[PDB]
């Protein structure tokens, strides 16, 4: 019940196309890495929102 309260911390927000070995990865993989960073952020947001909702439903119940 109370473990659903605290959000889980996250890594750095994104891959800002300056730490990437941009002379090695192909164009598709170069897009994929930033896409993965953004999607990890989005999934973190959704998981935390779902945890908040589950906690609220649990306490109301």
């Amino acid at each position: 019940d109370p473990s659903l309260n605290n959000p889980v911390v996250i890594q750095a927000t994104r891959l800002d196309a300056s730490i990437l070995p941009r002379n090695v990865f192909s164009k598709s993989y170069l897009l994929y890495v930033i896409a993965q960073g953004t999607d990890v952020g989005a999934i973190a947001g959704k998981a935390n929102e779902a945890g908040q909702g589950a906690y609220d439903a649990q306490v109301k119940n």
């Binding site: 800002d16 196309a17 300056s18 990437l20 941009r22 164009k27 170069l30």
Partner: peptide, 11 residues
């Protein structure tokens, strides 16, 4: 100063 550039991978 203006110059001709090509956009590549955020650079």
């Amino acid at each position: 100063a203006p110059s001709v550039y090509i956009i590549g991978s955020g650079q």
